[PDB]
Ligand binder design. Structure first.
Ligand SMILES: Nc1ncnc2c1ncn2[C@@H]1O[C@H](COP(=O)(O)OP(=O)(O)O)[C@@H](O)[C@H]1O
Ligand SMILES: [Mg+2]
Lengths: 165, 118
């Protein structure tokens, strides 16, 4: 079983994927490292090279030929706070917060794959989240999408958005 | 001769029209598909986008805005890259409601940091 863990930068892909590999007893693989060590990166090339029981970590993981995609979501304010913590520029932060707001990755994943499970991480510990994913795979559910609408929180993410004229 | 900026976002679930002043600091109007339609399933509809935009435009006109420049966020898939009719429908609804349309710029956000494609 090949599971992609994808979502906006800062959403918790790495945290959740590592914990998931541990709890399911699968192997954890970070996509960046993999791409570098197998030699800008070409997506077709990467897709060949990926192609075990693997939790695959990256925001490009949904463009790879996996068995299941897990799209992690988070309130775009959380994305903003985390990307400020990383030291991203104001514009890069705004761009990513907006990407989360408009479901950019989700839209990509549903376009690429049939089995897409969307998970809202908001106000959850990594443990609660991994157990949620597990309960779903075990259920087993192949597809769940359309479970967050961040337009509903729009006023709260305004300070992070690229609004200046 | 007061001009604003219409920020238009088309998402998987909804459409947002946020009109600000020229600086972007002052909010003139903020409307979503979810504010104008009763049913969750109609929130993504381009008809909902059109009605939301109509309300935003009417508010902006009442507040003295003559025209809007547009900044559009319209994400589309990686395989087929299709934004859908919604963002453009909202723009058209802004025009028909009586706003002049200024510069139109596509700011559709690209999530990045990690691997960087070419
Ligand atoms: N469920 C969670 N609860 C609290 N903090 C989290 C959670 N998931 C991730 N984090 C924190 O958010 C930050 C970004 O997580 P990370 O896994 O690097 O995101 P990504 O891999 O999506 O870029 C990390 O410092 C991590 O400790
Ligand atoms: Mg990570």
């Amino acid at each position: 079983m090949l599971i992609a863990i994808t979502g906006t930068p800062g959403v918790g892909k790495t945290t959740i994927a590592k914990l998931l590999a541990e709890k399911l007893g699968y192997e954890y693989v970070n996509l960046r490292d993999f791409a570098l060590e197998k030699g800008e990166v070409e997506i077709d090339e990467l897709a060949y090279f990926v192609e075990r029981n693997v939790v695959l970590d990256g925001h490009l993981s949904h463009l790879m030929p996996v068995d299941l995609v897990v799209v992690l979501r988070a309130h775009p304010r959380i994305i903003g706070e985390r990307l400020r913590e990383r030291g991203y520029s104001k514009e890069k932060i705004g761009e990513n917060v907006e990407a989360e707001l408009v479901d950019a990755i989700l839209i990509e994943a549903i376009d690429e794959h049939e089995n897409v499970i969307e998970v809202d991480t908001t106000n959850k510990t990594p443990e609660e989240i991994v157990e949620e994913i597990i309960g779903l795979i075990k259920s087993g559910v192949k597809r769940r999408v359309g479970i967050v609408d961040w337009s509903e929180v729009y006023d709260e993410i305004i300070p992070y958005l690229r609004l200046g004229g | 001769e007061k001009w604003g900026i219409a920020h238009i976002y088309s998402s998987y679930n909804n459409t947002i029209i946020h009109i600000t002043d020229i600086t972007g600091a002052e909010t003139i109007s903020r409307w979503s598909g979810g504010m104008v339609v009763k049913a969750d399933r109609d929130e993504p509809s381009p008809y909902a986008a059109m009605l939301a935009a109509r309300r935003a435009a009417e508010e902006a006109l009442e507040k003295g805005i003559v025209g809007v420049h547009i900044r559009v966020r319209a994400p589309g898939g990686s395989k087929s890259k299709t934004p859908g009719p919604g963002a453009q429908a909202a723009i058209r609804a802004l025009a028909r409601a009586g706003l002049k349309i200024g510069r139109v710029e596509d700011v559709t956000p690209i999530p990045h940091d990690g691997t960087r494609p070419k």
